[PDB]
Amino acid sequence: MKYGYFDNDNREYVITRPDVPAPWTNYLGTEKFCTVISHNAGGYSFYNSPEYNRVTKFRPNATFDRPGHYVYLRDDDSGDYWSISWQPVAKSLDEAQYQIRHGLSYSKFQCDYNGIHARKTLFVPKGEDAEIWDVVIKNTSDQVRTISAFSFVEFSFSHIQSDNQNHQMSLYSAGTAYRPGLIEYDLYYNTDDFEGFYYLASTFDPDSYDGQRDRFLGLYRDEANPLAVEQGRCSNSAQTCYNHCGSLHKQFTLQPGEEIRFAYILGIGKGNGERLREHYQDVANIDAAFAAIKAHWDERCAKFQVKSPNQGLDTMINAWTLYQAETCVVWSRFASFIEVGGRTGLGYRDTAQDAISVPHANPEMTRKRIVDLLRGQVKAGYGLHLFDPDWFDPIHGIKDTCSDDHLWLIPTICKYVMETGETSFFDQMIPYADGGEASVYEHMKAALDFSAEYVGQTGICKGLRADWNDCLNLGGGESSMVSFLHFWALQEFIDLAKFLGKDQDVNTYTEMAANVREACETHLWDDEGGWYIRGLTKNGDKIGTAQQQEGRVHLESNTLAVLSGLASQERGEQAMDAVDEHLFSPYGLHLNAPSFSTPNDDIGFVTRVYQGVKENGAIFSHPNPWAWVAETKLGRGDRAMKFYDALNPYNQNDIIEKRIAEPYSYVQFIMGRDHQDHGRANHPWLTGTSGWAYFAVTNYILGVQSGFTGLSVDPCIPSDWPGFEVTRQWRGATYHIQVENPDHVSKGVKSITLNGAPIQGRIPPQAQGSDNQVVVVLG
Amino acid sequence: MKYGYFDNDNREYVITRPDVPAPWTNYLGTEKFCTVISHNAGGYSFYNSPEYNRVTKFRPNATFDRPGHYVYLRDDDSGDYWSISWQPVAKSLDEAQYQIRHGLSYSKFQCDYNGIHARKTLFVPKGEDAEIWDVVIKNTSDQVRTISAFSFVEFSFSHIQSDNQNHQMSLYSAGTAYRPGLIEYDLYYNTDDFEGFYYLASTFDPDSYDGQRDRFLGLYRDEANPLAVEQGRCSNSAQTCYNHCGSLHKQFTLQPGEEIRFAYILGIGKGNGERLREHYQDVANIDAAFAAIKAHWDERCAKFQVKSPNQGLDTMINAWTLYQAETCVVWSRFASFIEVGGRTGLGYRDTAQDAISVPHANPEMTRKRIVDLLRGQVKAGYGLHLFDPDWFDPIHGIKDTCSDDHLWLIPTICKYVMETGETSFFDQMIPYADGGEASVYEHMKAALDFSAEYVGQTGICKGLRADWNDCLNLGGGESSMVSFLHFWALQEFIDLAKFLGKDQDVNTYTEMAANVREACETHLWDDEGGWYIRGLTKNGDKIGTAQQQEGRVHLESNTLAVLSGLASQERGEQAMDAVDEHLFSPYGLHLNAPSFSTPNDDIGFVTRVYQGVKENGAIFSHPNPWAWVAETKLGRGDRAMKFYDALNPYNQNDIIEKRIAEPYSYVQFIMGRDHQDHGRANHPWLTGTSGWAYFAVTNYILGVQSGFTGLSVDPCIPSDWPGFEVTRQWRGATYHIQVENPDHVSKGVKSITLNGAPIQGRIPPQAQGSDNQVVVVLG
């Protein structure tokens, strides 16, 4: 079963029927004002901080996703009414035809019902902290029609906790006032004239309005049947206290075939509403704003485009996955339909990894996030697991420290400089979260040294509070995952030190890496099973061996052993063969097998989690891309693509009855084989799987990698691929790459020509604005 | 407009139409399991801790109060369905007749619709941690009817925060399993077999069941139209993860006039569901449990009953206000439809005051709360503003300390001993919250000494974080309210010291009281306005003077000046005349006038609050009873009764269009004259107004007071009252008091006879079980 399809030409996902088994969302905004909106217009907006500056309310985890940003239409001759989005009125699907087009930073809602065609485009324009509701109403019937339009949003008390509880205070913390075409919402206790005021404006001069939720909706009614809409007019309510809304109404008379256009604007700050309602009265200004949003992503998408034999890969890499990855970098991970309160700010390992994915498209935000992370690192070398970057914009103990957090930043910083060429970044002085300062370079060394310090007697990194797996809590125990990550970070740093001419550091960290490899190869390999163990408990018991009944094969240890470059080709192939044989499923790779069932606090909370769920035996998406990278390093492109195709949301467009979640978005996890709902995807959008998938495909499968001295092209693809093409923008120059595979191999470059001339090795960075033809022949 | 009436004979409030402008709630439970239920069966249950052991979910502050504890009925011949409570199905009120009877610790729901009579009684039986749903269905039509019944509750993830957010974790934290007539809900991460399991059972053997919320309700449907109910059968769902519910269904065939009875049971703990569903199959056990709940309150009500010329007073004192006050003592203040998360445990000043109200009816719980408060006091003498008594069941700094908290405990402890005669309580050793221990007596002295230490250069108590008024934040500034409270506490302690023969302490605290009175009479009286000021800022500027434009007359300072006994009769009368002239309104006494409008942090947050709202110029109920007491001390009974009648919810039974809130419950505050909604009552049930109102009427208007050596009767009533009668149980003996007012005075006892013999002064405590005739003649 399917509910829509991908429109490649318009870079939009088209939902043809709104009765999807779950809300399929999209993100509006690219700067500070953000809206998480569903295909049923449910959702909410916030400014900068989802926790402290929510703009409109949201009642989560319910059968309906309300409230939202709704436009109700009413036939004033019959009294019939419906919404442009299917919900909340939910007019029969046998009578009304709905369509939703989710695009990059905008969503188009359409409804054709009983002679009236209506369209509503919701998007947050660049340069403003507001959301435009571009509405078009057309009379397609053969008679004159009189249609009234009503808007609705329920204003938030701003702090999520105040919307959910402590109403003894929040119910008396705000008020509404009305001015022509503008409902002004005042957060009475917020003295800031910008952040302390919200508004809902209309480009038309209203016939009626409502600022009080209880008056617009009415007693014993909700968003599905507002009293104001049913009766055909608002009550012109506005006062201090209780719950507030933004409802503006206007009646229109339409001749047959006639259409009208107007807009509603939801925004923040005094003065802006009056200004924007006037500005957008000239629809050309709305079209210009929309064009700017299209340009924003056209510019980003153009920097990396691929044409290959795999349509699913092309569709996702050329738009959707780039989009999802950058959304994570810009908006972090705490504002979705799943993350709706509590945690806020930046997750250290999350943003550290996300930031490695799109420096080619958004170097400015990538740099900003990297600086945020460096400011969030303590002198000891570790990172603050969860923090608000605004805290350090010009601290927990070791007990709350996760062992992997800080290490992820090394490869990311190196990649940022490789991509931008901003070598001076390493000399920038950045303060530590707990006092003092150091250059970016020294911050990196502090991280590498920390992991060398916190090891066990055999040289394996301690797991501490938790490693990448939040449910693997070893403390004094040791993590294979962390040691492999340490090795990867060390390899990256060594290359940097060589490039910078830091001979002393090259020797120091080459020696450190050598010790890590020796320790891992000696202690972490299980020669009976043929794979790498997950780690060891504080008591020295190995976790993940061939003789255990639970949790024998783990995805993190085996994939990272290869991704880091630590494992030999021989052990790498066998370990990954174990991954394929025991963890692969048509929906992707399971995190571990068999699932844990016996509580064991020497291992972690994972042993107390349902089988096939979350960290315990489910298909946790994030590490899947690590397997793809591992396979490319082993030179097995067909294996890598098998894994890619299985997890690619695009290929599950017609199995929604099982998947449930958006076919254009990677999710946190899919129920594993041990759970009856095996196949059901959970938590779309804000997962690091997106950035890693993008990074893995672009840098390893397609094999395009920026470097300190040049651009490398070393693909690992399915042997049956005749070749592929990639357009890559790097440091202001364009590289038109054509890969040919006449002998049908998977990996191995026979020759590379730059503008007709054969070259050896990397492609040196060419002049700004230059266009270069790169032909790579495999063999 | 009215929506119901008081049924004095059955001690119930009868709601005749369910479309009340707000949810009118009741509290089920008297031990550990509690349910906050509305007249539309909306609401939730929790065990001991509302914050960490919520049993069923609640989506607060919305147009509908859902979810709840619902029973859906369906005519299987037509497919028509409705709920016993009006909502959530909301069958037309022109077709169905609904009635709700809220009683003491039970609620009766009734629905008569199209030939079917249905009744549902919800109550938490003593001795069990569960809620019984006693259902009776009767076919009143002239034909055979086939009716199916379905239950519904949405199980909570237990921690309120987990229901509201962090679903990335909570959605996978529980599961359901089914056994005959029992849906077992497992909080997977809670290892306790009792607290970690909930259930919904039926006395009947089900035809179908549903443990998954999404299957019972269905896609794009909610509690108003569950798919299971519409189709006439559940899907027999049960699994781990996602949202869970407790739905059990059974079809019944009823001959004309035939009726059936069965029950649903919502509860906690493994093993209990299977046991109780069997136990209640014998309806006699349900009736016995209900009889125990009736006995519980009959015993309590009988200890103080009044018969006077004022029906509203009698109705409330003989049942409703006693009920509300004890509900506060037992369940604290953090579980209502307003308090739904965040704060939990005990508020120091709140429980300290509440505990003075019902020691005659529930001495055990009163003692328990007093011990909780003593354990929550630090060596310095002050109390922890908000704490969980379970923490100290065998700490903030001075910056978070409120200046009044600890003082309220003195009069309360003295009253407890006067009431019970447990003089040995003073010698009990109780540990301080921050280490060390001291006798109850010494704990009290530590509190009194603290307030003598923290004073300004003129001898007035510092306001610190805040005094009784949470929005009056003076810090180094001084509070008139605190000094008056200190004087009251000192007077109470001095009497105790005298009684115990502690001569040294008598002299010490008599001297301390003398200094407080001199300082207050010299510095706090405004001789231009004729009242007591509210306090002084840290800079020495008086707050509440005749020359100021905002906040001239305050209720707290003027009432407490008299209640404490500090003010002279002359100043007391004039100050209270200012209260009457400037603060009285038909809805009660305003807290201050004029309202504040200019932000002034030297005074407090009250200057930043909307006018006529909350602490800024609204009718804050809590201090109103203080005015009643003040008037009785001045001997003006008519004035006291005028204030009582104005605030008495009972008298507002037919002005619901303005009041909105329950006419049987005192509320936190009523919108003041400065707000357009003047008259609207907010936050019923959990307000200290109830305990204070009960204490004020019983001890001062009716004038019945227990003492260390005897019972006192010194009433202050309206001069036109011919007299009144009171039945008082004290220390195991009954006192049948008859007050006669032949000369029509307001206060002043001419004679008192005990069993026919004239006596002078207090009535000595008589023998256990004795019945005594007390005749008091005023004059």
Ligand SMILES: CC(=O)N[C@@H]1[C@@H](O)[C@H](O)[C@@H](CO)O[C@@H]1O
């Ligand atoms: C105006 C306002 O919101 N006042 C409330 C006050 O009534 C309440 O007692 C306190 C509890 O912490 O919070 C706020 O101060």
Ligand SMILES: CC(=O)N[C@@H]1[C@@H](O)[C@H](O)[C@@H](CO)O[C@@H]1O
């Ligand atoms: C099983 C489970 O609930 N796991 C989650 C984990 O996925 C998440 O990353 C972490 C965040 O603090 O909380 C829990 O550990």
Ligand SMILES: CC(=O)N[C@@H]1[C@@H](O)[C@H](O)[C@@H](CO)O[C@H]1O
């Ligand atoms: C935002 C967040 O806390 N994401 C975590 C991620 O850091 C962790 O690596 C992974 C595995 O446990 O689970 C995700 O939920």
Ligand SMILES: CC(=O)N[C@@H]1[C@@H](O)[C@H](O)[C@@H](CO)O[C@H]1O
């Ligand atoms: C439970 C609670 O915090 N109740 C407070 C009470 O202590 C305070 O005396 C009063 C006046 O500010 O306001 C109530 O909301």
Ligand SMILES: [Ca+2]
């Ligand atoms: Ca037409």
Ligand SMILES: [Ca+2]
């Ligand atoms: Ca404001």
Ligand SMILES: [Ca+2]
């Ligand atoms: Ca160019």
Ligand SMILES: [Ca+2]
């Ligand atoms: Ca009949």
Ligand SMILES: [Ca+2]
């Ligand atoms: Ca359990």
Ligand SMILES: [Ca+2]
């Ligand atoms: Ca007796």
Ligand SMILES: [Cl-]
């Ligand atoms: Cl994730």
Ligand SMILES: [Cl-]
């Ligand atoms: Cl209150």
